[PDB]
Amino acid sequence: CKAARFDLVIVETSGIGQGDAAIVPHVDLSLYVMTPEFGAASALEKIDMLDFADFVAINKFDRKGAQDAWRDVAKQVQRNREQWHSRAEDMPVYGTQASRFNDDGVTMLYQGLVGALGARGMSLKPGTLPNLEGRISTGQNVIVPPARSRYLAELADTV
Amino acid sequence: DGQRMGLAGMITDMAQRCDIDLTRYAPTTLDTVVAGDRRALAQLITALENGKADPELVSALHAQAKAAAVPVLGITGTGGAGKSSLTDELIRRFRLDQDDALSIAVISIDPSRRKSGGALLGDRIRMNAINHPNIFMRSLATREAGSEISQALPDVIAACKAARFDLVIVETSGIGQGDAAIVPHVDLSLYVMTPEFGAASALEKIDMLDFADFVAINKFDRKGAQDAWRDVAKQVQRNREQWHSRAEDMPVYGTQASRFNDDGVTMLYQGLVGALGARGMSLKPGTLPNLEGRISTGQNVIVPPARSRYLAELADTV
Amino acid sequence: ENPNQGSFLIEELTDLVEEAVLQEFERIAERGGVLGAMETGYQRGKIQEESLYYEQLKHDGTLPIIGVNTFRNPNGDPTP
Amino acid sequence: GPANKVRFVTAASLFDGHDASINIMRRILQSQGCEVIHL
Ligand SMILES: Nc1nc2c(ncn2[C@@H]2O[C@H](COP(=O)(O)OP(=O)(O)O)[C@@H](O)[C@H]2O)c(=O)[nH]1
Ligand SMILES: [Mg+2]
């Protein structure tokens, strides 16, 4: 594939376990996805993939604990990184939402990946999208504020 | 002094000072082992782990294991599923029902750190009900680059079996999707799952379900509990190709480990008792309320989720 | 425009249907919103199951539907 | 290094609600590439 003189190569592996990090030496850049439901905070400190992932993304704030997972994951990434003298909110971990179109976190991740590719020296044109800032999307353009998920219960109680 | 010389340097000196192996201290026979010692038992376990024993010893171990005729039950699943808690609950139910008249052995396997070289064998912490001479537990690490089982796991399994115990439970590390390292070596298979596992179609490519004997879903608190159970049961039926049955009767039941005295836990214990009886191991007649059912009704739950977000209502009132 | 004069049955059916509908509403809410229902295909599968049950019963014939399960006139079924 | 691995166990004495010291000890020990069962 590389010999095809293409701009970019992207490879997705199979669903991984815990002790599996075979992709480390065969590629250049490492993106690892994660879910808010992953287990206890003390548990996560045994996920070996965090030892090499250049970026880690928790996707979709479907369930709860999204912010909790974000804080814990960022803190553990710092812990494994040995970059003690830096605060967590700047770490290269971003949480997004796949199903929702035009997600803010997706844009943030794209801007970061553009920066990373520029670091490796990849020829390309200057940026065009509004270079927004942030670390977690606010869930904009959502149909319903989660505050009223169970309105039917309110209607039943009303009746 | 810890601030002066530094905790890092103190730990380095501690690590380097304790550096010596105890390989020469292993025994050379199994007589005292079958006698019932524990320290020599751990000695044999360690010697097998490092492979410092004669092949004659291992051959004798296998010979005795061929006469062991004992239950070997493995429990595995995704990482962070919570299998350890389920194991603890099962052990507790065993003790409660059988009046501590059994000889329980437990083996856990945890991943190693492929970079640093160390590991964090953090599973004994969750379990709490092993405060007894008649139930023994042991943990082992990965230590190998690729697999999720020991380079001598069958050897230690045979050694543990030779100790004339009642039943051996074994758990590996959190598995991926293409792994079946627990299938051929053990006798019975328990697989844990979570409601947040992806699309319904995704359920059709979890290879572990192919050899699974019994599948349980944990932490029913979250959404989709009933829907996830439905899809799991339907997929299990499809993979079994036993079209002659209706869906609800398939041998798949899911429980909520954390909350005390879960009904589904008792149901699963009843099923596993039936399974062992079908394979024929000596045990006393049942004594607990042996209910029927398929999914726990959330008994004794503190708050019916129908009133989960009351605080928002109070704020709106104000 | 009000045939309820003399009717216990209309009121009984009304209240029972209302209770059933509200119970289904509570179940839907416990399913976590209509959007979540759409994502998980809850109601789609439910309708699938109920349609299968209805068709199975219709093919069984234990439900009286006039002119399909009986009254098969000996003239055959040409149906131009 | 030596084929043997360092196995440790860490815990707190009865009735001391603080725990962070255990964590600080154990994470450093882990950094030193030693297997420890923290109970
Ligand atoms: N909601 C819920 N959480 C649970 C339940 N059982 C265990 N957990 C969570 O799982 C954690 C323990 O996971 P653990 O067994 O140590 O991870 P494992 O050893 O890799 O399987 C606990 O901290 C609990 O928060 C349950 O029944 N319901
Ligand atoms: Mg574990």
Side-chain angles (χ1 to χ4, degrees), chain A residues 1-4 6-74 76-84 86-124 126-159, chain B residues 1-55 57-65 67-150 152-163 165-218 220-233 235-243 245-283 285-318, chain C, chain D residues 1-4 6-39:
Chain A
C1 166
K2 291 172 65 176
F6 283 16
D7 182 78
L8 169 64
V9 181
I10 304 298
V11 42
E12 277 195 345
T13 68
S14 307
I16 77 176
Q18 184 121 36
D20 38 357
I23 202 58
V24 170
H26 285 291
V27 306
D28 162 58
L29 246 277
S30 310
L31 223 325
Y32 167 68
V33 301
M34 198 195 300
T35 140
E37 294 190 13
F38 71 104
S42 304
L44 119 151
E45 303 185 359
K46 70 205 286 293
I47 312 183
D48 270 72
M49 190 52 182
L50 305 182
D51 196 82
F52 300 90
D54 297 331
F55 292 101
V56 177
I58 40 258
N59 208 339
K60 218 210 201 314
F61 304 158
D62 176 20
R63 313 313 220 101
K64 327 299 293 186
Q67 312 180 9
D68 304 322
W70 174 78
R71 285 195 69 265
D72 303 6
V73 167
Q76 181 42 66
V77 168
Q78 177 175 8
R79 191 109 63 189
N80 187 20
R81 179 71 75 171
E82 281 213 18
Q83 226 305 324
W84 301 64
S86 178
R87 41 175 193 167
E89 52 213 20
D90 19 323
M91 289 309 169
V93 178
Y94 293 86
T96 184
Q97 173 177 1
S99 299
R100 174 64 52 78
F101 77 131
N102 202 338
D103 163 76
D104 321 3
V106 169
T107 60
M108 305 170 185
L109 168 65
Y110 182 87
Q111 197 169 334
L113 248 296
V114 159
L117 266 57
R120 255 73 179 88
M122 275 56 217
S123 50
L124 43 88
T128 326
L129 275 179
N131 44 91
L132 298 189
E133 85 172 9
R135 49 264 182 179
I136 57 175
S137 183
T138 181
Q140 198 184 175
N141 206 266
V142 58
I143 304 308
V144 15
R148 287 184 177 85
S149 70
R150 48 163 50 92
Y151 44 86
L152 294 187
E154 298 182 6
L155 308 187
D157 298 325
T158 310
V159 175
Chain B
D1 186 60
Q3 185 177 172
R4 285 305 306 270
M5 94 141 293
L7 271 309
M10 240 164 181
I11 298 310
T12 58
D13 274 63
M14 178 189 65
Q16 195 165 22
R17 171 54 253 179
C18 306
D19 286 338
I20 180 174
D21 37 326
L22 279 74
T23 73
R24 39 76 177 177
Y25 218 172
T28 61
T29 171
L30 293 169
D31 43 57
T32 174
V33 172
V34 71
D37 184 272
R38 277 74 258 271
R39 185 140 69 106
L41 160 68
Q43 198 85 309
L44 168 64
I45 297 308
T46 52
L48 296 175
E49 178 181 9
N50 284 339
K52 297 301 132 49
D54 251 8
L57 323 178
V58 190
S59 305
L61 259 327
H62 294 189
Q64 295 302 328
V70 288
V72 182
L73 198 165
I75 300 181
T76 51
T78 105
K83 31 78 177 157
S84 311
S85 56
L86 176 57
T87 293
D88 162 67
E89 285 288 346
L90 295 178
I91 297 174
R92 168 162 294 279
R93 296 304 193 278
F94 262 99
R95 291 188 65 261
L96 196 267
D97 180 52
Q98 278 300 115
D99 196 72
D100 283 58
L102 307 185
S103 312
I104 296 183
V106 181
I107 305 181
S108 61
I109 297 178
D110 297 62
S112 311
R113 270 287 187 267
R114 92 176 77 261
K115 172 58 218 62
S116 313
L120 199 160
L121 283 74
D123 260 24
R124 285 275 251 81
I125 164 70
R126 278 68 170 84
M127 211 298 183
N128 76 280
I130 59 177
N131 307 98
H132 231 70
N134 332 30
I135 295 88
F136 173 72
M137 214 301 199
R138 186 54 172 280
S139 59
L140 299 176
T142 290
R143 188 180 299 180
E144 184 192 303
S147 45
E148 68 144 340
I149 55 175
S150 151
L153 170 63
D155 333 17
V156 61
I157 285 300
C160 175
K161 289 171 57 177
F165 278 40
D166 185 71
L167 145 75
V168 175
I169 296 283
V170 58
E171 291 187 338
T172 81
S173 310
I175 81 179
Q177 203 159 355
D179 20 8
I182 206 63
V183 168
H185 280 328
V186 319
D187 172 87
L188 240 277
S189 302
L190 215 315
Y191 168 78
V192 290
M193 197 192 296
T194 112
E196 267 247 325
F197 79 109
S201 304
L203 187 58
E204 306 194 8
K205 54 187 299 295
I206 302 182
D207 298 64
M208 180 47 176
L209 304 178
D210 228 329
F211 296 87
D213 319 3
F214 300 98
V215 172
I217 332 289
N218 299 26
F220 276 9
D221 63 332
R222 297 299 193 170
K223 305 191 50 52
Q226 296 199 21
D227 305 334
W229 179 94
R230 288 177 56 263
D231 303 8
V232 167
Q235 175 54 42
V236 166
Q237 170 179 358
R238 133 176 47 259
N239 198 12
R240 188 72 61 185
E241 296 188 358
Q242 215 305 314
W243 334 75
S245 165
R246 58 174 172 178
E248 46 267 46
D249 309 339
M250 290 305 168
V252 176
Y253 303 125
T255 166
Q256 178 170 343
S258 61
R259 208 161 185 280
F260 75 101
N261 195 256
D262 158 81
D263 318 17
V265 155
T266 58
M267 304 184 183
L268 175 60
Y269 192 93
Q270 211 166 325
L272 241 307
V273 161
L276 269 60
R279 272 60 186 82
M281 288 74 178
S282 65
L283 41 85
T287 350
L288 321 186
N290 48 97
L291 267 177
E292 75 169 350
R294 45 238 180 182
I295 52 179
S296 181
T297 175
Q299 189 174 189
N300 195 260
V301 63
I302 298 306
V303 51
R307 272 218 173 90
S308 177
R309 51 162 46 90
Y310 54 94
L311 292 177
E313 315 168 3
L314 310 180
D316 296 331
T317 281
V318 180
Chain C
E1 288 74 14
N2 43 279
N4 56 281
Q5 165 236 18
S7 63
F8 288 55
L9 59 93
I10 306 183
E11 176 181 4
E12 182 69 23
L13 295 182
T14 295
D15 282 335
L16 225 63
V17 171
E18 165 190 346
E19 293 183 2
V21 169
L22 267 311
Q23 214 152 334
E24 189 175 1
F25 277 175
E26 180 183 4
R27 279 210 216 82
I28 292 297
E30 297 300 324
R31 253 52 187 168
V34 185
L35 285 74
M38 300 159 69
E39 190 67 24
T40 60
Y42 165 82
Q43 58 282 13
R44 177 171 313 101
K46 195 266 183 62
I47 295 301
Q48 284 294 335
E49 182 184 8
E50 76 135 284
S51 55
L52 174 61
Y53 172 86
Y54 181 87
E55 200 172 21
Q56 165 198 191
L57 290 205
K58 175 180 179 298
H59 191 197
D60 179 25
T62 32
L63 187 63
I65 311 180
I66 314 172
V68 44
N69 25 253
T70 172
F71 219 145
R72 299 162 185 260
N73 315 86
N75 54 256
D77 48 357
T79 67
Chain D
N4 79 316
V6 199
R7 309 99 170 269
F8 262 93
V9 152
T10 181
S13 177
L14 81 176
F15 313 147
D16 196 5
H18 177 273
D19 2 22
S21 58
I22 315 173
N23 208 169
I24 295 181
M25 182 70 169
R26 70 149 166 274
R27 275 199 274 265
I28 269 66
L29 264 300
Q30 178 182 357
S31 66
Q32 258 36 250
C34 312
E35 49 184 353
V36 49
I37 317 170
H38 150 241
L39 48 93

